Design a protein around this ligand. Structure first.
Ligand SMILES: Cc1cc2nc3c(=O)[nH]c(=O)nc-3n(C[C@H](O)[C@H](O)[C@H](O)COP(=O)(O)O)c2cc1C
Ligand code: NA
Length: 148
């Protein structure tokens, strides 16, 4: 029944770890999941899933991943009405009001595209631990219930 595409942007693996946890939780909720890195993914292919997820870092005081700028821009130009989305990220709370700003940007981009938020965005500090894992499971549960 349900499909999902999880894209991640990463440099030291934390956000790929986050994407992996989300893919696992979705798979364990009987979702067929595609997972790919953002720079190797076209929005036209991404949008074919019922559930859309971006997991991406924040850099240089609030900067988006440079390899994800095209994907980000293409996302906002696409009609994603009927799609269920969620955004998550690992970042560093030391950057204060720049903590995981990329998560906020992608959540806004999905909003302009007309997609329906399936779960509250998840902002993780550095590596995901037990609490983060439980939060990413509720995240996945929210997407499935919203999409189904
Ligand atoms: C130079 C530099 C600048 C950073 N700036 C931010 C930032 O503005 N906001 C944030 O949340 N994290 C910032 N970070 C932290 C990364 O987002 C964080 O380490 C994240 O876990 C890396 O994810 P990745 O392993 O998937 O690449 C910065 C890290 C570095 C090295
Ligand atoms: Na472009």
């Amino acid at each position: 029944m349900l499909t999902a595409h999880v894209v991640y942007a990463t440099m030291t693996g934390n956000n790929e770890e986050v994407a992996n946890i989300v893919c696992d939780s979705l798979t364990n909720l009987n979702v067929k999941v595609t997972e790919s890195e953002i720079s190797q993914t076209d929005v036209a292919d991404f949008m074919k899933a019922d559930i859309l997820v971006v997991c991406a870092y924040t850099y240089d005081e609030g900067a988006m991943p440079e390899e994800g700028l095209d994907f980000y821009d293409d996302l906002q130009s696409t009609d994603l009405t009927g799609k269920v989305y969620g955004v998550a990220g690992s970042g560093d709370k030391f950057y204060g009001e720049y903590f995981n700003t990329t998560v906020d940007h992608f959540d806004d981009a999905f909003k302009k595209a007309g997609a329906t938020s399936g779960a509250e965005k998840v902002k993780i500090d550095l590596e995901p631990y037990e609490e983060d894992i439980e939060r990413l499971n509720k995240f996945a549960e929210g997407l499935v219930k919203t999409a189904s």
